[PDB]
Amino acid sequence: QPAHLCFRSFVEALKVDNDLVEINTPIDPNLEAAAITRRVCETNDKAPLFNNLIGMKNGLFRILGAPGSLRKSSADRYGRLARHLALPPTASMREILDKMLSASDMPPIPPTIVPTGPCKENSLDDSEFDLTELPVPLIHKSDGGKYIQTYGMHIVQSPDGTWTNWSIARAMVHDKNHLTGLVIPPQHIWQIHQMWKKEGRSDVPWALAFGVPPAAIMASSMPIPDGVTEAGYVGAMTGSSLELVKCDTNDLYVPATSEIVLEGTLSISETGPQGPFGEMHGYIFPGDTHLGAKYKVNRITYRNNAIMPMSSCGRLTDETHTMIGSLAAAEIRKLCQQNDLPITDAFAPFESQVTWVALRVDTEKLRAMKTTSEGFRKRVGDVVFNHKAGYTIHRLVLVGDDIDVYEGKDVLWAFSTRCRPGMDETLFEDVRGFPLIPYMGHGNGPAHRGGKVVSDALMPTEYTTGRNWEAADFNQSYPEDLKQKVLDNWTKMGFSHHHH
Amino acid sequence: QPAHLCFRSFVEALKVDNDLVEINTPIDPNLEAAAITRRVCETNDKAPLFNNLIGMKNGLFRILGAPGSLRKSSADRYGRLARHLALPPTASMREILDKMLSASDMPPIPPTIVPTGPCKENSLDDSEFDLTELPVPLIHKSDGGKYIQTYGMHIVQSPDGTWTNWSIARAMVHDKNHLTGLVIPPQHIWQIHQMWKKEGRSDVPWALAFGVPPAAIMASSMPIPDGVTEAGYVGAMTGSSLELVKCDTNDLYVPATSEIVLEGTLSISETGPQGPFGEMHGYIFPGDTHLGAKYKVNRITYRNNAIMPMSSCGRLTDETHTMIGSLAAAEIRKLCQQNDLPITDAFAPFESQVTWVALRVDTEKLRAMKTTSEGFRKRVGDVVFNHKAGYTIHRLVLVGDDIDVYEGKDVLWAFSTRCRPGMDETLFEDVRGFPLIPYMGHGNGPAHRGGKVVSDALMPTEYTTGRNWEAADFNQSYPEDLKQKVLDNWTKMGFSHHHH
Ligand SMILES: Cc1cc2c3c(c1C)C(C)(C)C[C@@H](C(=O)Cc1ccccc1)N3c1c([nH]c(=O)[nH]c1=O)N2C[C@H](O)[C@H](O)[C@H](O)COP(=O)(O)O
Ligand SMILES: Cc1cc2c3c(c1C)C(C)(C)C[C@@H](C(=O)Cc1ccccc1)N3c1c([nH]c(=O)[nH]c1=O)N2C[C@H](O)[C@H](O)[C@H](O)COP(=O)(O)O
Ligand SMILES: [K+]
Ligand SMILES: [K+]
Ligand SMILES: [K+]
Ligand SMILES: [K+]
Ligand SMILES: [Mn+2]
Ligand SMILES: [Mn+2]
């Protein structure tokens, strides 16, 4: 099976790439696996595969940390992401995001049902598992629970059967047969949960699949539109129908090669303690526990030698930056274009803790609009901040054609030198806010509303007659023949490899 | 003579440090020397010493580029700055800035007059030099003149003789015996020029000394208080009286070991075309020429084998970032402390193109003030933005004790995650603005007023009961004994030098 369609194959790809470290001596799921993974993430090291977890029982489970984190060299920086998508490991962020968007103007390819798969190799009923006895990791020292679910896919379906959503949302172990987790608006898991609540008749049929096809976990982390089944979008993207198997205890369908599958229900009435958790913006607020969604687990099925992927999230750089940030930026790029806005490119700079998106503008198109900063700012912000795709993003930075939005340094340069504080910004207080950002949930204002801004780093002539500067840098402040002479004589004069 | 007290000795120190490249083949002052220097600055390479300039006449002149720029390794990143100050090359920014501030609570050590020095080895009168025939550099391709003066010290004295100011301000060649330059408020050269204008009787006696004692060029680039003679402050800092010699044609005094000295007058009536120039924020606006201050040159004196230092300024990182930014931050730190504000540290992040200063707050002191964000923001901004030391700075970022303001990454993290846009900021529109910033001089608003902001990245509990988070990073989210075990086993498990 190819790496983009089978997690087990993806792990073997990372080995072959020399992008994996296999750790075959015992590692404690209480903190040590997550501490090793956190260090990997902070240093862009190789992904850790923990083949010997203390307390692993009945084949449950190995752990792979840092599945979507960055590689050290600039040449294949995004190579672990590329390997989720059948892209070359030297793929640029633009090429990854274009791949993730490519299904947005293709017909879906619905999934194929098969009678069995590797995910049915082993099973445990209600009387045979206990979630408190599995080697579930404690990820950060002050976490309020052991977060089993950091990189699996929740699968829920609308009551009418017309929409099946796949998404990542965190969950922790509550007791031997329940989890608690985040289920919050505007997320699709919440939108579907509301539908079942309003019908009022039963709990939501649910499954959580860990170690799913890498191309599926990428779509699971992207805000594709309301009502769009991720399976059919992944199908279209990959050009193949995904193979799914039916769960044993309900009628949902899971990827045939899933490593571990939990089957049960998401309650429409019950809650339980959840959190705190060390989160994407780089913080944990110890003691910050709240009531959350509660799940009941009725069955576990799993591959022989099952592997649990884990995100040890926090400060830069992990899956919550590379996937949440980038994939929201991609969806924002598309949204803007569908709303007739001249945006060519979007990215969430890591330096902003993925709370900003930089939008590159086609300023030729902009000039033809014959508009102003204030008008344009308002228009862009009204499109993005009233849409789900803008939920996690608090600052949009508009930049002209000379800025590469995939380079944080150049976004910071443009922000710092082209956007006059106050005058060149519009604040948005009556839009949904992202409460996880410390300045929202733990700040001075309402946790769920406002706090957003559009910062215009377009210069005045970019709206009228065209750019009227040159950069004071080596590239633009010297003629081409001089530049080349200097570069040709550089090491000869005594001054100091692309891959590395 | 020691390196901090003699430019020629400083160049020999850089050689010995293996922080110099001597280029003994011919280099064109039309662009090529500045292009090599710009590349050095963009890559943190060794400083270039051009010993063979095309068109060098009568011993005038060699060029040293990148005199105050950064070194490649993290260990001696600021080593070229340290060498201006008799500090070890591994000195931290905190230690450099503390050295620059140390004279602020010492009595001045006034300079010593000596009868001669190396700067009198050679002389040229009015009938013997022509500034248009010297190998003056064209620094950027669209510059409006050849900027002879990028790293020399202007010397002017109040009419009453009580204040002698030393400062850096740019100047370019106008004709055979005149320069034009920037002389703008609130700068001391402008403050003194105003005094002579109001007296109305004569042009301002002036000298411009190039290749001055490195400790003097550092003070020349710092906004020490109004009325304070830089020579006496440098004296106090270094613990020694500086040796000065009298100019031949006026009664000002120059450093005895200056490489090149121009003597003449700064006009109280005449102006001439100046600019454009590729500037500190990374731009040039071609064709943007304005009338500026005009200087007449009556005499040149110079050392045998004279060396002209040159800053090829623009995008990161050069003297306009390392010296303007850092030294303004230092003065701001002191100003805040003198105004009873609990600021421990200040730095202008390079990532902000030195348009921001991050102020580290002693939050124990802050709690004892029993204040609020809005009050505190206003107080800090009213102190800094109505003072000359705040002139170049458009955004102040307040951060708590856990942030190292000398690390841009940590300042960006705190800004992005702790300061809610709008709500946590106060805008300042009735303060002097820095017009060089593109969003000021070429922006949507008044070039000389407003555009400033105080951004509070203190969290709410930092004002009341204390920090209530831990970072979700390796350092803070794992116990000490685990951290050490992981680090001890890192290379054994298979994962990947301070100097490099
Ligand atoms: C890649 C990743 C993604 C998330 C999460 C984590 C990781 C690794 C973890 C589990 C490590 C962290 C956690 C977070 O704490 C971060 C977070 C992000 C957004 C909302 C809430 C929390 N999380 C998560 C998430 N969405 C959430 O609704 N609660 C979540 O718990 N997300 C984001 C979510 O998948 C995207 O918003 C998708 O668009 C949602 O799918 P649709 O609703 O559009 O179908
Ligand atoms: C290290 C350096 C510094 C400056 C300048 C450059 C370099 C290398 C050059 C020449 C390369 C660039 C140029 C600038 O274009 C940048 C600039 C900065 C601040 C004001 C105007 C321009 N410049 C300069 C500068 N001050 C200016 O009044 N016109 C100037 O021309 N400065 C700043 C100035 O020295 C400081 O503000 C001092 O505090 C002034 O001394 P006091 O007035 O307090 O005694
Ligand atoms: K999704
Ligand atoms: K702007
Ligand atoms: K000065
Ligand atoms: K704040
Ligand atoms: Mn969805
Ligand atoms: Mn001064």
Describe this structure in words.
- 2 copies of one chain form a homodimer.
- The first copy, chain A, has 500 residues and is of the alpha+beta class.
- Chain A has 3 domains: 330 residues, no CATH class; 129 residues, no CATH class; 41 residues, no CATH class.
- Helices cover 26% and strands 22% of the residues of chain A.
- Chain A is built from 13 helices and 22 strands.
- The radius of gyration of chain A is 24 Å and the shape is globular.
- Chains A and B meet through strand 1, helix 2, strand 14, helix 11 and helix 12 of A and strand 1, helix 2, strand 14, helix 11 and helix 12 of B.
- The structure holds the ligand Cc1cc2c3c(c1C)C(C)(C)C[C@@H](C(=O)Cc1ccccc1)N3c1c([nH]c(=O)[nH]c1=O)N2C[C@H](O)[C@H](O)[C@H](O)COP(=O)(O)O (2 copies), potassium ion (4 copies) and manganese (II) ion (MN) (2 copies).
- One manganese (II) ion (MN) binds next to strand 7 of chain B.
- The PDB classes it as lyase.
- Keywords: lyase.
- It forms a dimeric assembly.
How is the secondary structure organized here?
The structure is a homodimer of 500-residue chains.
Chain A: H1 7-16, E1 20-23, H2 32-43, E2 47-50, E3 62-65, H3 79-82, H4 93-101, E4 112-113, E5 122-125, E6 153-157, E7 164-167, E8 171-175, E9 178-181, H5 188-199, E10 204-210, H6 214-220, H7 230-238, E11 243-246, E12 253-255, E13 260-274, E14 283-284, E15 290-302, E16 307-310, H8 319-338, E17 343-347, E18 356-361, H9 363-369, H10 373-385, E19 395-399, H11 408-418, E20 425-428, H12 438-441, E21 452-456, E22 470-471, H13 480-493
Parallel strand pairs in A: 1-2, 3-16, 4-11, 18-19, 19-21
Antiparallel strand pairs in A: 2-3, 5-15, 6-7, 6-10, 8-9, 9-15, 10-13, 11-12, 13-15, 17-18, 20-21
The structure holds ligand 4MJ (2 copies), potassium ion (4 copies) and manganese (II) ion (2 copies).
One manganese (II) ion binds next to β7 of chain A.
